[PDB]
Design an enzyme around this catalytic site. Structure first.
Site, mmCIF file in Angstrom:
data_model
loop_
_atom_site.group_PDB
_atom_site.id
_atom_site.type_symbol
_atom_site.label_atom_id
_atom_site.label_comp_id
_atom_site.label_asym_id
_atom_site.label_seq_id
_atom_site.Cartn_x
_atom_site.Cartn_y
_atom_site.Cartn_z
ATOM 1 N N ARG A 1 23.611 -4.961 75.912
ATOM 2 C CA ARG A 1 22.458 -4.207 75.735
ATOM 3 C C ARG A 1 21.877 -3.346 76.649
ATOM 4 N NH1 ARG A 1 19.398 -6.556 70.373
ATOM 5 N NH2 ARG A 1 21.235 -5.328 67.826
HETATM 6 N N1 LIG Z 1 26.827 5.984 71.423
HETATM 7 C C1 LIG Z 1 26.961 4.799 71.908
HETATM 8 N N2 LIG Z 1 28.035 4.679 72.813
HETATM 9 C C2 LIG Z 1 28.154 3.615 73.401
HETATM 10 N N3 LIG Z 1 27.743 2.574 73.056
HETATM 11 C C3 LIG Z 1 27.263 2.107 71.544
HETATM 12 C C4 LIG Z 1 26.599 3.693 71.082
HETATM 13 N N4 LIG Z 1 25.879 3.343 69.923
HETATM 14 C C5 LIG Z 1 25.441 2.226 70.174
HETATM 15 N N5 LIG Z 1 25.928 1.234 71.232
HETATM 16 C C6 LIG Z 1 26.084 -0.271 71.201
HETATM 17 O O1 LIG Z 1 25.883 -0.628 70.031
HETATM 18 C C7 LIG Z 1 24.545 -1.462 70.475
HETATM 19 C C8 LIG Z 1 23.465 -1.244 69.680
HETATM 20 O O2 LIG Z 1 22.321 -1.767 70.001
HETATM 21 P P1 LIG Z 1 20.510 -1.350 69.372
HETATM 22 O O3 LIG Z 1 21.548 0.627 68.296
HETATM 23 O O4 LIG Z 1 19.888 -0.693 70.340
HETATM 24 O O5 LIG Z 1 20.649 -2.087 68.320
HETATM 25 P P2 LIG Z 1 20.825 -1.945 66.880
HETATM 26 O O6 LIG Z 1 21.687 -1.148 65.989
HETATM 27 O O7 LIG Z 1 19.502 -3.276 65.796
HETATM 28 O O8 LIG Z 1 19.190 -0.790 67.517
HETATM 29 C C9 LIG Z 1 23.992 -0.986 71.736
HETATM 30 O O9 LIG Z 1 23.966 -2.479 72.550
HETATM 31 C C10 LIG Z 1 25.314 -0.362 72.114
HETATM 32 O O10 LIG Z 1 25.871 -1.757 73.477
#
Ligand SMILES: Nc1ncnc2c1ncn2[C@@H]1O[C@H](COP(=O)(O)OP(=O)(O)O)[C@@H](O)[C@H]1O
Ligand SMILES: Nc1ncnc2c1ncn2[C@@H]1O[C@H](COP(=O)(O)OP(=O)(O)OP(=O)(O)O)[C@@H](O)[C@H]1O
Ligand SMILES: [Mg+2]
Ligand SMILES: [Mg+2]
Lengths: 489, 463, 463, 129
Positions: free
Chosen positions: A352
């Site tokens: 993350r």
């Molecule tokens: N648009 C995107 N482009 C690249 N990676 C993404 C994108 N959206 C999410 N991710 C990846 O998916 C993971 C989801 O993290 P996050 O959304 O903070 O946790 P949650 O889904 O539990 O809220 C992130 O660590 C990121 O690496």
């Protein structure tokens, strides 16, 4: 009377005490014979308590007293290179430890205003983690997998890699056998990485109370450097054993059971611990140090480990822990038995923090390779049924195979930043296309050896400084082209 | 009058009062000599009320006195909270001094009646490709994101914040986002340097607080949103304040954590007996009355990654547009990872969106559903065996699955590629061309993180 | 000073006591007027202890008198126990007269500390050469014979019994509760006729005895093995001991019984189990200290034909090596019938044993695997059409699988063969030579029951 | 020679009494003591020595060996030997006779599957002929 008390019930390490009206929540208690408890259940007419140590010398009608202080452990820089139990008592028999300070074991994390973003890297020596799933000082990440999948090998390799960096390390063992702990300590001492490591050991032959409080004492020991501008790193051998011990303690103590035969506040249990790892700001350091040190930012890193049954990630507990950390590394049995080591699943493992916790050269190079790997895996799975393919699909398939072979590495062979940079540059630029699918594992090792024997000043420049100037890339390209021709394996 | 503590287990604390001075429900109480406050949860007769402590219970023992305020937990509401960050009882935690506001409202209040319910009539573009086509939004509505841990809910929430809130004027937005501290501290900082902190209020709670604080965070944010929308400037409106909560699940998790200690028997999976009403009394207050409007976006957690869990299943009925994220699509590399199927919006009607939009959406969903059933046949018998009318469906389904992907402005730290934005008409034009059989010669590898169609053409040319 | 029985429910017997004298946990009491002894398990307040009856139960009535021994249950241990059979309390049952040993030990002891662990990881050498090369054991390890009822598992136990004495002069202990299948003479007679009887001590228990007798048998065996290990010779060093804890009938029961070796009851205490404190020390008591090493061999059943991961695997958590008995190879007549491929050990690693053994051991498994994969095509179309490259593989595989057979000293009194005890280094040398191909000229049948390599060449030249 | 017409029904009756005695249900179909209920019974069938016979009879009988044989019957549902009770009795007996239903409905009567029906003491009991 307010401090005096009796004992009315002993079973399985739980002692229930009458009296003790003047008793706080978490304040220690004194038993006959140098034994200390911990008041966790306060009731209308009784007090619950867990005994720290062997409880077989406790009967009904004895006496107890309240200390008036919370549980605390000795802490300092003199604990380096020593082995202690969950309360800080030395066990290796190398003489007493000259303690000067004590710190509370149960403490809240730094607030939101007193924190900072994480921009400094932490190296591990593994190509997979350092290029696809980066870690940085202050980031919390998880290692998840089955049993006998090499979960603990990755944790130690990381501890060994922190030799020239200057990061104090801690290690916590929960539920492990004594022989395995001794073997791990021998391995640490042999490699010289014990000069800065501290080991806390609550083995399987110890009461569940000890196996429950080990990570908290480890974190309290590790926070000493964080509160003073020096980095730290802590590893939990297995938090599943801690969860089992907590369920035991909360069931022997009368508390209503819940989903999966587990009790309430397991999420709170695993969250109040992990959130204590943070990167404080220079203002926080200055205020805590009372002006002794200025212009320094503390940090603390964590690497908890959780094991799973039958290799599933959709289980309730694994997801409850995934939702807390800032990433996860997944180790697959099917990849382990197939010769892919370390077995890391690119698709299901994420970071993350991202490129913030990287050097300039690595961040500029290791871009969009994890998603490419997942796309390759799905494309190959689909194409195993496809009758015919075209140029683009074949090119993607070959690149995926070569990359998945390049990411395999041996144990106790940590690569450095220059080695990773050279390998990733050679992979991306396309010099691994003509080489056979086999002999790739030989290719990277031979190339690293050649680039270490010659072009040494370039590697010195890359190691000391993470900058990636045009001169650096030109030199790397010229060197790789020189190694390609007029040089054999 | 004054009472005494007689029992304490974790967070649950019950205080015994006098015969005639028993505080009513939700009558916050102050514990003398400590920064902790208690709220009444249920009565037990005999002059005993079983309460929950707001703050840590470490440092307290049986026998301590308590003073009854005889009023619910009131928070400061006004124009002076703009640009300030505060904890759940409303104490500022930004080291910026006190807040100059005398207006205060209770956080427990009834729900709007049936008479004062207003319809929603205007669309609301967001720039995402899949959302603007398969799930149109509308002002004054309710939107929810459904996902399992690690699938991208947040990133999408931050993109929505960056894509609509920063542009609409006079919004007076409200932020109730609750997440890993690292993510929070960064937000406050990011909002500041952009100089948009002027018209935003924030209420934030962490994961490490005891169940007392995690239980009542959302009510505080709702109170601050209700005040803003209701007020009317002379010759003016309530500013159409927007609410964004990233902490809806914790409400129910704390509820089920403390339900067993309040004596409630286990139900269903083990969720609390009163799940439905507890979710309803909160999910109702987020509405648009005839006196104002509220546009809300929520994040809904899916435990164990199954949508038949009693917690996410109850929430489906309470939303207008539902967005569902799947772990498999995330593991396949496609971002954002939204399940084209199982995602629908109430505003998808031939009278609202139009005629062409409806046909495009239905044809896309039909193609994908047809492709979902041809996997087993391909497995058992060769791909060659299926007729050409299904080869076309398979290839178009693969192309459509990759074309719903675009790179985000926010998530550039991960991939390192520049962000993109696409208007609705471009989405419609591209999908109309695709379903028509045009762009059937372009390889499916050129539809990945390429955004608009002309970018697809250029990326295909580069290959 | 004397108690009374208060509550007889199943095996649990609650006994009250006077206020100033209540027995500490694990103390033993004697019931007057009957043959039964009680073991304390947990205290319940009001001077009431919860106990479990140890002797055979008969005609128990409420309020019986009971006198306290004030000490844990002590079992006679020494050198006179060799070749004898005793009850769970150590009382002999073989009609051979009283045991003359005068010294005894308590059966509830503590774990050796971290400072008493060994300074290395040594390998225990047995006579059998299949086991030694492919599934090496470890002094202080934990072994599991994953063998079904039909194969001759007992002769393997006997060969171990004989070889440890000869190999390392180490005694053994056998403990087991009941018998699952009767296909041959009961162990006692089957050991009497083979003259290995005087090197072992035996503890036995039926099932119609109270559940107390069925439990606490592994503890008696463990105490005896500890005394054997700690006894020193004139050189000031101890012995290596093997603990043969018999499986308790079926593995469904062994689910509790496997966990009974891990200190878990099969619903003896249905209200409040006391195992965390008793269990978990059991797994430790088995260890290799600097003075002596004790190892544990436990049999288990595999009805599903599923072992390890296919099996529940709860056993797989703590087992360091699994020995697998194959019915097909036994039909072949290669005794000992141990599967060379399915059996695994965690001690087979380049660090613990060295790179030489790892390189030699790993190669033979590859040849065996290749031969097993091509045996079907050899069957359908014959050996002649196969390329000569794989024919060498098949010949080498046949040679090693014949060489795995070994004459046993415990069966000498039946067959009349002189028997063999092949040292480990010689096995390594012979296997390396066979892998390299020096023995290729050597004809077949010179490895079947021929024991050591030099004996292989002697057999080859004698025919 | 003793024959139990059905042992699964005994397990059902024991389960009924246990459940009416307010004992906890547990995660399995039957309580955990069904295993011991069957084992305590099947353990009592064995051959004794001539010396034990003389010892018990006070010397009235000499040179004669007692015996007792058991042939219990267990009922299965759709040929599921993986259930709780069927697998508890398979593992504590010296042999199994597997009667199928496909052969029974096909006319082959008695329907005995030789592939899976085995004996342990077999070849010793049989006469020379
Ligand atoms: N648009 C995107 N482009 C690249 N990676 C993404 C994108 N959206 C999410 N991710 C990846 O998916 C993971 C989801 O993290 P996050 O959304 O903070 O946790 P949650 O889904 O539990 O809220 C992130 O660590 C990121 O690496
Ligand atoms: N890089 C590697 N290459 C080859 N083998 C490896 C590698 N890493 C680990 N192994 C193997 O895996 C073993 C490590 O297993 P691991 O420590 O994960 O087991 P565990 O029982 O699951 O762990 P824990 O100690 O946490 O209980 C090593 O002893 C070695 O056999
Ligand atoms: Mg381990
Ligand atoms: Mg989440």
């Amino acid at each position: 009377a307010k401090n005096e008390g009796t004992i009315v019930m002993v079973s399985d390490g739980i002692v229930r005490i009458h009296g003790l009206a003047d008793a706080m929540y978490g304040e220690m208690i004194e038993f006959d014979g140098g034994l200390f408890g911990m008041a966790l259940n306060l009731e209308q007419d009784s007090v619950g308590a867990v005994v720290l140590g062997n409880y077989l010398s406790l009967q009904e009608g004895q006496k107890a007293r309240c200390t008036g202080r919370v549980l605390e452990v000795p802490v300092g820089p003199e604990l380096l290179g020593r082995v202690v139990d969950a309360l800080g008592n030395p066990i290796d028999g190398k003489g007493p430890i000259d303690a000067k300070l004590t710190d509370a074991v149960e403490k809240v994390a730094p607030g939101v205003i007193w924190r900072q973003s994480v921009d400094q890297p932490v190296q591990t020596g593994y190509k997979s983690v350092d290029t696809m799933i980066p870690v940085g000082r202050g980031q919390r990440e998880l290692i998840i997998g089955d049993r006998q999948t090499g979960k603990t090998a990755m944790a130690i390799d990381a501890i060994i890699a922190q030799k020239n960096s200057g990061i104090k390390c801690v290690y916590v063992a929960i539920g492990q056998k004594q022989s395995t702990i001794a073997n791990v300590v021998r391995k640490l001492e042999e490699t010289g990485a014990m000069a800065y490591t501290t080991v806390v050991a609550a083995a399987a032959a110890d009461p569940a109370a000890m196996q429950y409080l080990a990570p908290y004492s480890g974190c309290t020991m590790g926070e000493y450097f964080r509160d003073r501008g020096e980095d730290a790193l802590i590893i939990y051998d297995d938090l599943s054993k801690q969860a089992v011990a907590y369920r035991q303690i909360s069931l022997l103590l009368r508390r209503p059971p819940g989903r999966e035969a587990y009790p309430g506040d397991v999420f709170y249990l695993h969250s109040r611990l992990l959130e204590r790892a943070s990167r404080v700001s220079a203002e926080y350091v200055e205020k805590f140090t009372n002006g002794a040190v200025t212009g320094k930012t503390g940090s603390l890193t964590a690497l908890p480990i959780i094991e799973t049954q039958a290799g599933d990630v959709s289980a309730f507990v694994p997801t409850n822990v995934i939702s807390i950390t800032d990433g996860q590394i997944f180790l697959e049995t099917s990849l382990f038995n197939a010769g892919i080591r370390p077995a890391v699943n690119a698709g299901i493992s994420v970071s993350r923090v991202g490129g913030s916790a990287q050097t300039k050269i690595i961040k500029k190079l290791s871009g969009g390779i994890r998603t490419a790997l997942a796309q390759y895996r799905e494309l190959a799975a689909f194409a195993q049924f496809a009758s015919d393919l075209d140029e683009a699909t074949r090119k993607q398939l070959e690149h995926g195979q070569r990359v998945t072979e390049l990411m395999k590495q041996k144990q106790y062979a940590p690569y450095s930043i220059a080695d990773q940079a050279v390998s990733v540059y050679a992979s991306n630029e396309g010099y691994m296309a003509d080489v056979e699918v086999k002999k790739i594992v030989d290719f990277d090792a031979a190339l690293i050896a050649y680039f270490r024997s010659e072009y040494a000043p370039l590697m010195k420049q890359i190691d000391e400084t993470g900058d990636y100037n045009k001169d650096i890339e030109a030199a790397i390209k010229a060197g790789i082209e020189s190694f390609k021709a007029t040089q054999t394996y | 009058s004054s009472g005494r503590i007689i029992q304490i287990i974790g967070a649950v604390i019950d205080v015994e009062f006098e015969r005639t001075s028993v505080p009513k429900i939700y009558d916050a109480l102050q514990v003398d000599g400590t920064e902790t406050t208690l709220e009444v949860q249920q009565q037990l007769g005999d002059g005993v009320v079983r309460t929950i402590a707001m703050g840590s219970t470490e440092g307290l023992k049986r026998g301590l006195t308590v003073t009854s305020t005889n009023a619910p937990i009131s928070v400061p509401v006004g124009t002076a909270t703009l640009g300030r960050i505060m904890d759940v009882l409303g104490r500022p935690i930004d080291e910026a001094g006190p807040v100059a506001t005398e207006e205060r409202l209770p956080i427990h209040r009834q729900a709007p009646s049936y008479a004062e319910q207003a319809a929603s009539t205007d669309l609301l573009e967001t720039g995402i490709k899949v959302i603007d086509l398969l799930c149109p939004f509308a002002k004054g509505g309710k939107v929810g994101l459904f996902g399992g841990a690690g699938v991208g809910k947040t990133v999408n929430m931050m993109e929505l914040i960056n894509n609509i809130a920063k542009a609409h004027s006079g919004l007076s937005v409200f932020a109730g986002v609750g997440e890993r501290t690292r993510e929070g501290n960064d937000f406050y900082h990011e909002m500041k340097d952009s100089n948009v902190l002027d018209k935003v209020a924030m209420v934030y709670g962490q994961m490490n607080e005891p169940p007392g604080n995690r239980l009542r965070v959302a009510l505080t944010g709702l109170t601050m949103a209700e005040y803003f929308r209701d007020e009317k400037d002379e010759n003016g409106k309530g500013r159409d304040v927007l609410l964004f909560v990233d902490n809806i699940y914790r409400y129910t998790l704390a509820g089920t954590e403390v339900s067993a200690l309040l004596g409630r028997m286990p139900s269903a999976v083990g969720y609390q007996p009163t799940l439905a009403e507890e979710m309803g009394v909160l999910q109702e207050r987020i509405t648009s009355t005839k006196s104002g409007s509220i546009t809300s976006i929520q994040a809904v957690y899916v435990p164990a990654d199954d949508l038949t869990d009693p917690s996410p299943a109850t929430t489906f009925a309470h939303l207008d547009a539902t967005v569902v994220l799947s772990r498999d699509i995330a593991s396949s590399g496609i971002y954002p990872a939204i399940d084209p199927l199982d995602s629908t919006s109430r505003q998808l009607d031939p009278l609202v969106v139009g005629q062409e939009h409806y046909e495009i959406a239905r044809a896309v969903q039909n193609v994908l559903q047809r492709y979902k059933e041809l996997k087993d046949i391909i497995a058992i018998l060769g791909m060659d065996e299926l007729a050409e009318e299904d080869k076309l469906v398979v290839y178009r389904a693969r192309k459509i699955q990759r074309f719903f992907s675009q790179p985000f402005h926010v998530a550039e730290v991960f991939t390192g590629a520049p962000g993109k934005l696409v208007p609705l008409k471009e989405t419609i034009r591209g999908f109309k061309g695709l379903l028509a059989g045009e762009y059937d010669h372009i390889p499916e590898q050129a539809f990945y993180m390429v955004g608009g169609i002309d970018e697809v053409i250029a990326k295909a040319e580069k290959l």
